[PDB]
Design a protein around this nucleic acid. Sequence first.
RNA 1: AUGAUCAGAUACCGUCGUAGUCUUAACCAUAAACUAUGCCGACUAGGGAUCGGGUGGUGUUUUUUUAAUGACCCACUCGGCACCUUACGAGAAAUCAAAGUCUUUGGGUUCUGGGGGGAGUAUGGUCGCAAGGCUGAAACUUAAAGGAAUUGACGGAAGGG
Lengths: 81, 97, 216, 206, 48, 129, 87, 121
Amino acid sequence: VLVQDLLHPTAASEARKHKLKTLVQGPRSYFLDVKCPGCLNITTVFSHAQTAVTCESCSTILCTPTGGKAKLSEGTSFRRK
Amino acid sequence: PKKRASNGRNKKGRGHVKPVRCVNCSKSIPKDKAIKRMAIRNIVEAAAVRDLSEASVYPEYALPKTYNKLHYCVSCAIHARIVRVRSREDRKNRAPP
Amino acid sequence: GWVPVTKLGRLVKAGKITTIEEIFLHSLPVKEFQIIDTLLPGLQDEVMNIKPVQKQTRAGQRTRFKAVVVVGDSNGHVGLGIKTAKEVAGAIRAGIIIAKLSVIPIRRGYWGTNLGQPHSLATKTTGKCGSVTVRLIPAPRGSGIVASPAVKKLLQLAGVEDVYTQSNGKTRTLENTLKAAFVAIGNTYGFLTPNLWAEQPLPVSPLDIYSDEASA
Amino acid sequence: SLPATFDLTPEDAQLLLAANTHLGARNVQVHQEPYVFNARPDGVHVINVGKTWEKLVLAARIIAAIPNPEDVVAISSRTFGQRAVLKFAAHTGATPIAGRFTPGSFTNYITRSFKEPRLVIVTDPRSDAQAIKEASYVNIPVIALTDLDSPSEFVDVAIPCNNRGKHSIGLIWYLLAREVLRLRGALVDRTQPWSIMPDLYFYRDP
Amino acid sequence: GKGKPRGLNSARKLRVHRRNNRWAENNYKKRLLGTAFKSSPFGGSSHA
Amino acid sequence: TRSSVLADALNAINNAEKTGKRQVLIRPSSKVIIKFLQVMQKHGYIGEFEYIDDHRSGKIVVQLNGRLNKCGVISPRFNVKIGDIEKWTANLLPARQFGYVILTTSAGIMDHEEARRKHVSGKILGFVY
Amino acid sequence: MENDKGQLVELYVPRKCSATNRIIKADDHASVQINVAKVDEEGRAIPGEYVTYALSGYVRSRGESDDSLNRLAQNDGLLKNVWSYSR
Amino acid sequence: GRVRTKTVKRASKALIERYYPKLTLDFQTNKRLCDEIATIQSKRLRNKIAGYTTHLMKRIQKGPVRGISFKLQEEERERKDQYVPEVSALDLSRLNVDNQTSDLVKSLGLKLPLSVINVSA
RNA sequence: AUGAUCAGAUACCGUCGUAGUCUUAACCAUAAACUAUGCCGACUAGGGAUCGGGUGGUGUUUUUUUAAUGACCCACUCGGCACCUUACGAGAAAUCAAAGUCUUUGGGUUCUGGGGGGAGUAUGGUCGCAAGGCUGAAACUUAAAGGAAUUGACGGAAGGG
Ligand SMILES: [Mg+2]
Ligand SMILES: [Mg+2]
Ligand SMILES: [Mg+2]
Ligand SMILES: [Mg+2]
Ligand SMILES: [Mg+2]
Ligand SMILES: [Mg+2]
Ligand SMILES: [Mg+2]
Ligand SMILES: [Mg+2]
Ligand SMILES: [Mg+2]
Ligand SMILES: [Mg+2]
Ligand SMILES: [Mg+2]
Ligand SMILES: [Mg+2]
């Protein structure tokens, strides 16, 4: 193609790219607030965590680290903050 | 001139590939350059098949096979009509016939 | 006579087309030499050399003659033809036909100050055939064509009065150096310059004004 | 611009989606094709038939601009389009070339099959590549009944269509013939349909 | 970057490279070693 | 590694104008790139360009018309006196009537003909025709 | 190009490609000049009344003639929804 | 071998291009009308051109033979080619779609009788 | 050392067989050590496979019929070993997605070459127990030596008629 708008790519085509190869680079990660079984104790956890994040009230470990996104434990209720 | 883009072997990213011996002349050849064929044959060669089938103590018998992987140097494979010389345009064909 | 077979040949025989600028403007492919010597009756030719080529055979060498011809009229147009033949006279005759078929225009210009008529080329321009590269540089007035003899006669036949030339490669290969110089003067109408920047109304083709003066 | 009777009617849309002209290629897609509208969970893509209608009426405008209608040339070496270009050549002044395009028909001015067209229309650019390749030697525009995976080099107007199907190729040639006769004025009724059935342009087995 | 250095302070490298590669010639090497004065029968004169 | 962001910009513009494209994305968008593009734009060789502010260096999207044959850089930035301008223009411009040698003088970045009007010289950056 | 007192010289001011603004040379045998017929209020094409597009051999060999002709036709109003700037 | 040469096979096909409505599927009548209407210097060559022209006609009774183009033959083939098909195969009097065809036609701003079926992978 | 072949055959073929082949501690520092393509950076065509990681898909399959998993499938992306097609381009061509963006010649930097021999030779250093390695000429001699393709002729090369 020889004529195209480089300043206004479509939303789909920007979502297809790598995070550094977009127009302005930005993270595709996010934060979550996770609530642990029992005590309410909302806590914010990074999406690609690298640490075994636990709530301050009890050892009720909320996520396990993996190569990419953290695996949230099974009885947990998250909202994408 | 350079005759083949692959240098007559298959080696892209090693530097060294440990060699094998030709089954016909005991020449040392790299394993990627060799002419590997796989000779799968019944043992009884289809002319003695009726005589052994009626000579068996068993009915329904298997008539088993021999399996061999033959490794050929370039000289012996060309001399034994396994591969032969092809035209310049027809060297680039990698498919079997 | 001629009894042409092309739409363009019928138009040029009828007198609808009175210049070859219309052919160069609409990029009409010429395939009949009578069009060229009708629309440019004043071009005069010159045969550059005759060298013998040889094909080996069962007993000896089949030999043929290669003749290089340059036609041109001395303001704006040149053609180059090269033909191999069994006979030298056939090679020269057919080379004159081929050289007439390949006639292209030349953009002459000024080295400065636009006072008289255009004496020199408009830009530096290059061409390449084989290893040979010929470059052509605009020269002041009275400089003459500074070139080796073959490409000097080609630039004389184009209508250039003065140009500096630089070569590269096996320039003793005469056919390659003539084709390189031919490409170099063909590129003069290829370079886009600020006087050419303004837009044009894209005129409609003579093949559709005069569409019923074709065969049917 | 156009008087808005040239919009895609529901009758013509019924014809298009009946013939499966929308059913484009497989996930092979030449990158020169923005004509595709979505995709099917199958892996087969869907063509935007509105764009097919707009490209078809543009090609009809291009065909109608030619002064002498014998200067239009229609090519189909595929059997599914031979009857189509013969019927298009019947209903319009165009000369057909059905079957073999002998090379040197656009070049080689002493050949017996020598044409000098002002526009050439092919059925498949891949199979009819000899015609478009010679047309690039003598300054001739090319209109092609393109698919989503066709080799669009030296094609100037590409009408996107399913050129794997029998009914689609014939329907595209039929609609093209109908539109050039409507613009020429042989069919004065722009809104009323044609007495010629689109089934006339179809391939038959023997 | 075409071989040779191009920096604005890189004249020394270019000079010494040109001297070293000037030794590869025939006439330069002959004139600077002075083989005509040493290993020629005429000793560098035209006649004898 | 990247030594000359201006050279990379001009090479990208040249590849775009060879391919026939009407636009090109330049990364990473220095000041000298802006001033070079402003010189090309005033003579009518590019058209509109826009500076995208990411927070790292910037990018630029230039719009290309069909008028540019070759924009180049001259590396290194040789020191150029006033007779040197006329030898440089004779060496690397196609004719004596068009094309500009761009050179950074102490009164800003300009082309060679405006430098002749101001009677100022400097270092050579590139060329445009 | 002109001399010191008008008198246009440089015979054959050439055509330029409608897509890339490039000069169509005298031997660009791949280049074409599209004529699209004009319509007036009845559905019928007027003979000799065209909108004209020159396309150079370069963009035709690269395969991008069809998109260039789409954008040129849609800009002139003779297409409605074929070409998209946001690609 | 009795394979005919160019001269026989070339003159005969030229002869059929311009004299197809006169000549017939009988060698004898064929060998008489060529003898006036063309010049052949020998009787033996006249007998082979007429003999192959008689052979080619029988081939023409059943379909087209390659290498002849006279305006008559294709036009008669053009004439008997309608077949006048009972009902247009495209038309369903009593159409089917996938979901993507359905939202395509809803994007076009057209309302038309549709039956949506899922076409799954 | 031997037994054949042969005009000869201390070569090819056969039977034995020392050093070696293996390993530890020291040296040696060369190979058609090859992709005969230095490294870093940017841009310029498509395509389908595969290897490693990630993301998405109410996707198949296994297991606690439902779950994560694991293995597959589809789409995308990053990095890799490569391959296929064009020829924008390049080239003397063979060919090359780099060997392109190179007379319209300047992104950074290192190394090497300047007709064929004599010659990787003499000589002097320097490393090594040695074998040798690394640096490395000249006198003199010569009008070609060479590269890639073409057409013939031939082949104790392969097919066909
Ligand atoms: Mg060899
Ligand atoms: Mg190795
Ligand atoms: Mg020179
Ligand atoms: Mg510096
Ligand atoms: Mg010497
Ligand atoms: Mg021995
Ligand atoms: Mg080496
Ligand atoms: Mg690199
Ligand atoms: Mg992956
Ligand atoms: Mg990959
Ligand atoms: Mg790898
Ligand atoms: Mg050789």
